[PDB]
Amino acid sequence: KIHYRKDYKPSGFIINQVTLNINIHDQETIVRSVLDMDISKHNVGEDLVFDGVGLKINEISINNKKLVEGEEYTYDNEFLTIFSKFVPKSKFAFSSEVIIHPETNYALTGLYKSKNIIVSQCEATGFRRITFFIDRPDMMAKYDVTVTADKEKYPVLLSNGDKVNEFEIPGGRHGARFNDPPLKPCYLFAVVAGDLKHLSATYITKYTKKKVELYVFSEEKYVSKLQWALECLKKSMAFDEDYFGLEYDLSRLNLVAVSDFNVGAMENKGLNIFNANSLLASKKNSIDFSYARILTVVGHEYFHQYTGNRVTLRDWFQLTLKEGLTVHRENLFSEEMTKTVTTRLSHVDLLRSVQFLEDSSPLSHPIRPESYVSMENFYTTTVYDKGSEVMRMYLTILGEEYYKKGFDIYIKKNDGNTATCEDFNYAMEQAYKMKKADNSANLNQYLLWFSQSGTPHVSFKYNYDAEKKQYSIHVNQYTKPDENQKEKKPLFIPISVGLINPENGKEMISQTTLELTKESDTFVFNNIAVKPIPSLFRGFSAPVYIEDQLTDEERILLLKYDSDAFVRYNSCTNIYMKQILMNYNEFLKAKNEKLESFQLTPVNAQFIDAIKYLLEDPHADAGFKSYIVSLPQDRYIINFVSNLDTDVLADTKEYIYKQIGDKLNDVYYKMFKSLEAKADDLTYFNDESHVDFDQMNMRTLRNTLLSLLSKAQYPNILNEIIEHSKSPYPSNWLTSLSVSAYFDKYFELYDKTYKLSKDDELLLQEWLKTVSRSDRKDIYEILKKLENEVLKDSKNPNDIRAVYLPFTNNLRRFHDISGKGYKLIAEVITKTDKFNPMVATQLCEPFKLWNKLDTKRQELMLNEMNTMLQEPQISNNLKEYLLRLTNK
Ligand SMILES: CC(C)(C)C(=O)N[C@@H](C(=O)NO)c1ccc(-c2cccc(/C(N)=N/O)c2)cc1
Ligand SMILES: [Mg+2]
Ligand SMILES: [Zn+2]
């Protein structure tokens, strides 16, 4: 069935109180539930219909009268229908006892078992897999939850709210009662049982001086990997206090790591549950990225406490209101904590590669969709990351002072209530009126950011009159028509701009944000002493395709002398892209015309000189340096090429890398050697509280340079690779594995790094990723080895994703013209879909670009998708996803 946003209507029923008894046993979990219910004003005497998926009914009742199946109710394993004539017309109690088995729940939705932990996951529609409920976010209720289990196996019992009772039970069992008086939607319900060890701390709030108990949990084996997460939690609480003036309102907050998790983490009230790879880390057993990952994910779930938990959603179409806004708050947090420009750059890099691809694919949708079949296919990079950019633009338009005012209005006005995207825009509009100093100013046009799909294209024309010292910027915006909107409307686009004097590299004007509200506009500047080079969309001030129309000479100057990190980064990107497009077409024509000889346009020499200039600047950011020596992501490039021949693009990249390498390899090597001391500094290796993001960036640079030098077969570089494998940092000795791919010492380091990784679950998954991403000619044989020797029949999403997803980024091998890469992944998708439809859909990501490739590869991918579609036992999740992707 298809749900439509305009069709929203309040339920005809009210659920005031939920009283749960969850009794966990060896071969079953018995769930007893009493729902104190009422009749709403929207009731028209309809049947009482509960959500309830895969529940085994022992008994159901109304006001303690046992109901008879068939006569008074029906249950089709999805909906429990109680005929209206048996439904009371005033306040009543609905009770039920059902049986579920978390032990065999491999979908990881509802209540399930992860190794030796019983854990729940209810967003979005997972609560209905635990007990009967009107499973929607506008059904707010109070929760009284009791959990019982075997004491030896599950000594630690957790749920939302305050633990009010702990008691022993005959037969070596024990129970714990949790009462949570504040109203909440059921997707925020959580329960955890297991042999958990913890680290703890006490946090005192900034303004009201409230004592908050912080707990982080994991299995005993990995308790030593919990410290950084605890630090991140404290940092998160501090930032929301310092930036937004928001304090935590509960007495206790628990973070819990589990090994089997479909996503990163979940913001269950007082009981945040994490993928282990997004909470656990140690410097000996984790790559550098884990530390940024944990900071962001812990921060993300914490910021949800206000934007998501205290102010909730009216319905699932408003998802971006809590997700886009929280990612935004998460990004502000991370930028403040890392104090490096690459943090912002990394988010732009992800958006413009992954989300832009989605936005131009058949899966394209606005951040607030008008319809859905599977809400499990709703949680997208569009909703999250474009949503975050849409939320961030409010800040750019209003400035920090008035944004904080607007955000405060939103929280104060909607605290303890459901809300919609209109509620947030309204709050922002109030601050906009204050800032603009007139009550006529509005943000009605801004709502189009929520409803209109596709990536806007913004192009520029420039003119300078030396006589009148007058400079103008003519701006045009354009969004391609798609299946969502035949006619696209102009958006409110904020363009943060600077003007650089090309003669001395100085700023010519103060900080300025151009407010483009029409299809096109001309912005004029007086008293401009000399023809400037425009610095456009500073900080990437809008989620758009930027077409600056600058010469490479101008882009080089910005790269060298502009103040804004993104514009420098983007100028470099634009120089690369122009080169990539030119060489691609040259290679393409040669292939098509079967030429015996042809010419390639060399890489701009002045550009190479500029890279060398920045690399040799001691005061330049190391992380920034790693970006400029790296070509744009393949998934970014494909947005600019029709019928992309992946082999030709691979040839293009290889030529460009070799050209730059032929001039800069000596510089690369010199830097790789000189960076070693600070990058691999071991001083704080045994201090899990000391995290230096600048240092980790230096390792990123070294490992990027090492990769370039290895591919280039730089003289005696194998020696460097061998010594690199002896480094204590996993980021280094895992890099040594992947860069050794070009040498016969590869399988030696394969065995060495495996032995180092095999005893840590998360580290082994990083090893799998490194092997999967290895630039090997025998990569298919290697994958077969991974399946037979390591992966086997594991149902762990982390294991499966680790083995297969990095390989799909192998431009040359995954897109083998035989189609065997497409066939391989499709088999894994179909296989995975049998027990975990959600992860199966995640594994479909490489097919998202299917209609952007050359016609042969289009046919190959389409055939595999249609083959998957013809699987008799295909899930609703996978089917709907593939149907949309293939325009059926
Ligand atoms: C930060 C990251 C995106 C990695 C994450 O962990 N997000 C979760 C979140 O919002 N935590 O607060 C997240 C991501 C997806 C989902 C979700 C919920 C329901 C369905 C689906 C789904 N079907 N994805 O394909 C995905 C739930 C939580
Ligand atoms: Mg403070
Ligand atoms: Zn979230």
Closest CA to 292 of 349, 237, 238, 335: 335
| d(C-alpha 861, C-alpha 855), whole Å | 10
- CATH number of the domain to which 532 belongs: 2.60.40.1840
Domain presence at residue 5? no
Which ranges of 712-817 would DSSP assign to H, the alpha helix? 717-724, 730-739, 746-757, 761-772, 779-786, 797-804, 811-814
How many other CB atoms are found less than 10 A from the CB of residue 673?
12
| d(C-alpha 702, C-alpha 404), whole Å | 40
- CATH number of the domain to which 633 belongs: 1.25.50.10
Residues 273, 259: contact at Cβ < 8 Å? no
| d(C-alpha 799, C-alpha 821), whole Å | 19
Tell me which amino acid residue 260 is. D
Q: How far is the CA of 238 from the centre of ligand 2 (A)?
A: 5
- 332/236 same-domain check: no
Residues 710, 719: contact at Cβ < 8 Å? no
Indicate the resolution in Å: 2.0
How many other CB atoms are found less than 10 A from the CB of residue 302?
25
- 714/572 same-domain check: yes
Last residue of a domain, one of 175, 196, 217: 196
- Tell me the best of 109, 122, 123, 358 to mutate to test the pocket of ligand 1, counting ligand atoms within 8 Å of each CB and taking the most: 123
How many other CB atoms are found less than 10 A from the CB of residue 142?
17
Give the residue whose CA is nearest to atom 15 of ligand 1.
379
Cβ partners under 8 Å of residue 755, min gap 6: none
Q: How far is the CA of 338 from the centre of ligand 3 (A)?
A: 21
Task: Please report, for residues 239, 388, 449, 451, the alpha-carbon distance to residue 320 in angstroms, rounded to integers and kept in the order given.
Answer: 22, 8, 11, 11
* H or E element that contains 777: none
- 557/534 same-domain check: no
Domain presence at residue 368? yes
The answer to the question of whether 168 is labelled as a binding residue is no
- CATH number of the domain to which 207 belongs: 3.30.2010.30
Domain presence at residue 817? yes
What are the contacts of 583-587 at 24+ separation with CB within 8 A? 583/652, 583/655, 583/656, 584/641, 584/648, 584/649, 584/652, 587/648, 587/651, 587/652, 587/655
| d(C-alpha 165, C-alpha 178), whole Å | 7
- 558/702 same-domain check: yes
Domain presence at residue 3? no
- 275/288 same-domain check: no
Whether 301 is a known active-site residue: answer yes
Cβ partners under 8 Å of residue 528, min gap 6: 464, 469, 470, 471, 499, 508, 509
The answer to the question of whether 323 is labelled as a binding residue is yes
Task: Please report, for residues 8, 271, 304, 658, the alpha-carbon distance to residue 260 in angstroms, rounded to integers and kept in the order given.
Answer: 34, 17, 22, 42
Ligand at minimal distance from the CA of 264 is: 1
How many other CB atoms are found less than 10 A from the CB of residue 400?
10
Ligand at minimal distance from the CA of 307 is: 3
Last residue of a domain, one of 282, 311, 335: 282
Output the six-digit token pair for 780. 């298919």
The answer to the question of whether 265 is labelled as a binding residue is yes
| d(C-alpha 403, C-alpha 396), whole Å | 8
Helix (H, G, I), strand (E, B) or coil at 496: strand
Which ranges of 266-310 would DSSP assign to H, the alpha helix? 289-303
Give the residue whose CA is nearest to atom 13 of ligand 1.
263
Residues 58, 99: contact at Cβ < 8 Å? yes
Q: How far is the CA of 274 from the centre of ligand 2 (A)?
A: 26
The answer to the question of whether 690 is labelled as a binding residue is no
The sign of the torsion formed by the CA atoms of 858, 859, 864, 869 equals positive
Q: How far is the CA of 301 from the centre of ligand 3 (A)?
A: 6
CB half-sphere exposure, 594, CA atoms < 13 A: 0
Residues 586, 598: contact at Cβ < 8 Å? yes
Helix (H, G, I), strand (E, B) or coil at 273: strand
Domain presence at residue 224? yes
- CATH number of the domain to which 438 belongs: 1.10.390.10
- 128/232 same-domain check: no
Cross-strand pairs, 174: 149, 168
Domain presence at residue 528? yes
| d(C-alpha 172, C-alpha 304), whole Å | 38
First vs last Cα of the chain: how many Å apart? 15
Give the residue whose CA is nearest to atom 11 of ligand 1.
266
Ligand 1 atom with least separation from CA of 125 = 19
Domain presence at residue 106? yes
Cβ partners under 8 Å of residue 409, min gap 6: 427, 430, 431
Please provide the DSSP assignment of 32-60 as one string: EEEEEEEE-TT--S--EEEE-SS-EEEEE
Domain with 241, as residue range(s), is 197-282
- 717/791 same-domain check: yes
Residues 311, 411: contact at Cβ < 8 Å? yes
| d(C-alpha 368, C-alpha 345), whole Å | 25
- 506/612 same-domain check: no
- 554/679 same-domain check: yes
- 127/99 same-domain check: yes
- Using CB distances shorter than 6 Å, the residues near ligand 1 are 123-124, 263-267, 297, 300-301, 304, 323, 376-377, 379, 384, 838, 841
How many other CB atoms are found less than 10 A from the CB of residue 210?
14
CA 327, 328, 334: angle at the middle one, nearest 5? 85
- 160/256 same-domain check: no
Of 219, 301, 389, 880, the catalytic one is 301
Strands 117-121 and 191-194, by their bridges, are antiparallel
- 731/860 same-domain check: yes
The answer to the question of whether 270 is labelled as a binding residue is no
| d(C-alpha 865, C-alpha 856), whole Å | 15
Ligand 1 atom with least separation from CA of 327 = 1
| d(C-alpha 267, C-alpha 275), whole Å | 12
Q: What is the largest CA-CA distance in the chain?
A: 95
Domain presence at residue 794? yes
Cβ partners under 8 Å of residue 230, min gap 6: 199, 200, 201, 214, 216, 255
- State how many domains the chain has: 5
Strands (DSSP E) found in 359-466: 371-372, 418-419, 457-465
Strands 211-219 and 196-204, by their bridges, are antiparallel
